[PDB]
Amino acid sequence: GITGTWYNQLGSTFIVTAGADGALTGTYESAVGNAESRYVLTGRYDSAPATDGSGTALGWTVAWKNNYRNAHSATTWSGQYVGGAEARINTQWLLTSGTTEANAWKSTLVGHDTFTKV
Amino acid sequence: GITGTWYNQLGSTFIVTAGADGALTGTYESNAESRYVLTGRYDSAPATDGSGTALGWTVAWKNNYRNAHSATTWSGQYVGGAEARINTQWLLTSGTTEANAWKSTLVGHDTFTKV
Amino acid sequence: GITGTWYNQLGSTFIVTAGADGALTGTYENAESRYVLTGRYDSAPATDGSGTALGWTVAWKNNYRNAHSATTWSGQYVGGAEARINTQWLLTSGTTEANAWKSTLVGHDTFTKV
Amino acid sequence: GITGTWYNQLGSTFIVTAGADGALTGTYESAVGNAESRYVLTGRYDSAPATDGSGTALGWTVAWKNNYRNAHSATTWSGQYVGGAEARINTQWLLTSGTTEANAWKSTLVGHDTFTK
Numbered sequence: 001g002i003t004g005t006w007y008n009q010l011g012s013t014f015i016v017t018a019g020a021d022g023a024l025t026g027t028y029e030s031a032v033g034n035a036e037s038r039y040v041l042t043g044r045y046d047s048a049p050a051t052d053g054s055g056t057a058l059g060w061t062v063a064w065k066n067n068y069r070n071a072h073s074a075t076t077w078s079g080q081y082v083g084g085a086e087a088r089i090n091t092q093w094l095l096t097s098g099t100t101e102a103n104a105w106k107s108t109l110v111g112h113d114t115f116t117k118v
Numbered sequence: 119g120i121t122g123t124w125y126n127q128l129g130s131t132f133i134v135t136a137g138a139d140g141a142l143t144g145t146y147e148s149n150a151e152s153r154y155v156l157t158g159r160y161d162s163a164p165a166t167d168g169s170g171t172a173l174g175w176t177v178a179w180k181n182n183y184r185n186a187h188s189a190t191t192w193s194g195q196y197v198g199g200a201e202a203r204i205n206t207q208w209l210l211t212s213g214t215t216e217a218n219a220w221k222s223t224l225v226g227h228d229t230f231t232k233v
Numbered sequence: 234g235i236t237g238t239w240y241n242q243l244g245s246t247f248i249v250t251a252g253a254d255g256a257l258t259g260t261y262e263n264a265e266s267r268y269v270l271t272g273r274y275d276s277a278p279a280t281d282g283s284g285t286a287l288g289w290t291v292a293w294k295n296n297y298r299n300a301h302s303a304t305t306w307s308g309q310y311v312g313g314a315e316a317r318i319n320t321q322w323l324l325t326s327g328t329t330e331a332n333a334w335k336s337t338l339v340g341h342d343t344f345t346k347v
Numbered sequence: 348g349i350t351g352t353w354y355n356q357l358g359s360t361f362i363v364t365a366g367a368d369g370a371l372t373g374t375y376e377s378a379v380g381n382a383e384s385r386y387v388l389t390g391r392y393d394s395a396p397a398t399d400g401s402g403t404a405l406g407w408t409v410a411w412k413n414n415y416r417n418a419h420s421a422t423t424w425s426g427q428y429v430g431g432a433e434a435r436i437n438t439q440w441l442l443t444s445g446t447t448e449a450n451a452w453k454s455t456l457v458g459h460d461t462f463t464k
């Protein structure tokens with residue numbers, strides 16, 4: 001159910017596969033920031049979630065370097081899948097750049113993404 | 119210099135291998151009962167100008183014994199030198215129902231040291 | 234633009250007055266559910282269609298309840314017909330040190346005038 | 348306890364007064380970023396915290412406008428005061444800049460400061 005192709009509000013594309021032991025792998029395509037083309041993502045998810053109507057906790061990372069570009073940045077997404085009519089992944093993310101120690105205070109962006117398969 | 123074992127101040131320990139393909143893999147020890155698979159990515163080609171190396175990993179807090187129905191992501195950067203550290207901000211997201219989704223997510227920071 | 238009554242999607246409601254010198258003052262909503270708010274905004278935003286930087290704080294104490302916590306919202310006002318306040322918030326509950334790593338929740342809210 | 352002069356790890360100066368009512372008032376001066384001289388802050392704190400040795404939840408905002416400069420941004424600190432031989436305010440902060448709709452994805456920095464007497 002998590003496996004498949006997803007989109008967010010910004011129009012990025014995130015092609016995950018959810019493996020057996022809570023492994024998340026795929027590519028990420030973002031509509032924004034220092035980034036063109038596909039980046040490798042990997043993460044993890046809760047492979048044994050709750051029956052009680054609770055969602056499925058997951059997260060992934062993307063290092064924004066590929067064969068064409070290196071932003072010297074990395075983003076992590078934290079959130080939960082929710083199945084149903086409109087299945088969706090509500091996330092919060094943290095994007096950190098490689099900064100000198102004098103710029104580390106301003107090294108990290110925070111934001112939230114919502115993914116859907118539409 | 120990311121490869122190796124790292125300690126935070128909370129008593130948590132992580133062992134990670136920094137692969138040549140920007141891969142970050144290892145275990146997180148929050149007692150095998152407490153070890154969790156870690157997976158992430160890092161800037162395999164950092165600047166040499168005094169910048170740290172951006173990185174992120176994730177841990178889903180399920181293993182063969184427990185499941186907290188949650189996941190933590192770390193996003194931060196490796197800083198070399200004789201006093202090396204990984205400085206991070208994390209997001210802990212819990213499995214909740216929709217009416218509880220506002221209370222799904224803890225934020226924090228950790229520093230990691232080679233010790 | 235900001236001054237007035239804002240509603241989020243959780244039904245919850247706040248009324249604020251932005252004073253000329255970036256003050257934000259109002260209440261966050263049932264008497265028992267009303268709390269004092271205070272914040273600050275950029276009283277002189279760019280004129281480039283950037284929104285208006287602002288934030289505020291609610292400590293969750295009133296004469297009826299005390300949750301021993303504070304929420305702060307950091308976001309920006311985006312005016313016009315359909316105005317929105319898009320925020321991010323940190324909720325921190327007083328904790329012992331031992332539990333301080335789990336002291337602070339994060340999320341986001343979007344408040345509208347309707 | 349909370350009332351006083353505070354500094355963070357950045358060499359920033361946080362000068363705050365806590366009201367009986369739960370109001371925070373004061374001035375912040377940051378060592379870093381698009382800032383010089385003092386800025387107005389306002390906040391709230393729990394004016395009747397727990398008895399369990401829990402910290403005092405609190406928060407404040409600085410919109411970064413003063414007569415010297417304007418960064419079109421606001422930082423919200425959220426945290427707790429911790430009494431003791433080493434009084435300390437541990438916080439997480441959100442710095443949101445006014446951005447266009449297009450750049451809103453990168454409007455908000457997150458970070459953490461701890462303030463010492």
Ligand SMILES: O=C(O)CCCC[C@@H]1SC[C@@H]2NC(=O)N[C@@H]21
Nearest residue numbers: 012030032033034035071073075
């Ligand atoms: O460093 C860069 O400029 C590249 C960052 C990638 C864009 C971010 S990651 C969080 C958010 N979600 C997206 O789909 N895009 C942005």
Ligand SMILES: O=C(O)CCCC[C@@H]1SC[C@@H]2NC(=O)N[C@@H]21
Nearest residue numbers: 359377379380381411418420422
């Ligand atoms: O937008 C700007 O450049 C002004 C922001 C002020 C710098 C920040 S606020 C969070 C952090 N704590 C400090 O003492 N300084 C920085």
